[PDB]
């Protein structure tokens, strides 16, 4: 399984952001809004293939969560679909980026601004977000934003859609890696 693939929790479907590890322990990053109140995650709608269980969740304020893999046999590729990812970097204004998610597949665009505050309502405000002109739709949450082989963000949310165009905000991946002491591979 790799970046962009669907993940299911007891509540819904999100996307796997990046496979990460610390020492010999493998995890996957995804959106905090998807990890919030979820415990176990599966690879299919039938919930037959277990992936693992939530190990951390930061949402609102931030929007990241990490799940520890309990599934021993499933391949955990260090890619986004077929794309290799080899490092992580900070987004810059003007940067060409690409998103992959479980509903809309792959879509490209550019970073238009940094340190954006997105107010999802009801007290759910997230801060320090990367703004871009890439679309995203429901189910795309937590998928990877990358540039070439560089990991850059996790899909959090936005407006519009892929038909008519939209704005999507991503959580900087670097912050998540730092918080959990993990790294891409």
């Amino acid at each position: 399984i790799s970046g962009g693939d669907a993940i299911y929790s007891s509540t819904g479907r999100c996307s796997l952001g990046f496979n990460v590890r610390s020492g010999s322990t493998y995890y996957f990053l995804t959106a905090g809004h998807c990890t919030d109140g979820a415990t176990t995650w599966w690879a299919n709608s039938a919930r037959t293939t277990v992936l693992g269980t939530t190990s951390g969740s930061s949402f609102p304020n931030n929007d990241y969560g990490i799940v520890r893999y309990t599934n021993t046999t499933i391949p955990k590729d260090g890619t986004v679909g077929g794309q290799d990812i080899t490092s992580a970097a900070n987004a810059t204004v003007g940067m060409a980026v690409t998103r992959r998610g479980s509903t809309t597949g792959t879509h490209s665009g550019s970073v238009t601004a940094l340190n954006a505050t997105v107010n999802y309502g009801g007290g759910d405000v997230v801060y320090g977000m990367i703004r871009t002109n890439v679309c995203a739709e429901p189910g795309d949450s937590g998928g990877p934003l990358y540039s070439g082989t560089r990991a850059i963000g996790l899909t959090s949310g936005g407006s519009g859609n892929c038909s008519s165009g939209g704005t999507t905000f991503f959580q900087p991946v670097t912050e998540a890696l730092s918080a959990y002491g993990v790294s891409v591979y």
């Binding site: 509540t11 999100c14 809004h33 997105v118 429901p138 959090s156």
Partner: protein, 51 residues
């Protein structure tokens, strides 16, 4: 679902579908509710889950 707190300028992208009266499956409550607003209150919820 109550759409009074709408509209909202952004929606998170988790998928938990709702079936609108336009026979369109809405990806999540936030999306559905912004549609209701945009329809000026004409769109209703048909039922939970995919259409």
């Amino acid at each position: 679902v109550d759409c009074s707190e709408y509209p909202k300028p952004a929606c998170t992208d988790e998928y938990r579908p709702l079936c609108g009266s336009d026979n369109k499956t809405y990806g999540n409550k936030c999306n559905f509710c912004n549609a209701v607003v945009e329809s000026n209150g004409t769109l209703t919820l048909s039922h939970f889950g995919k259409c």
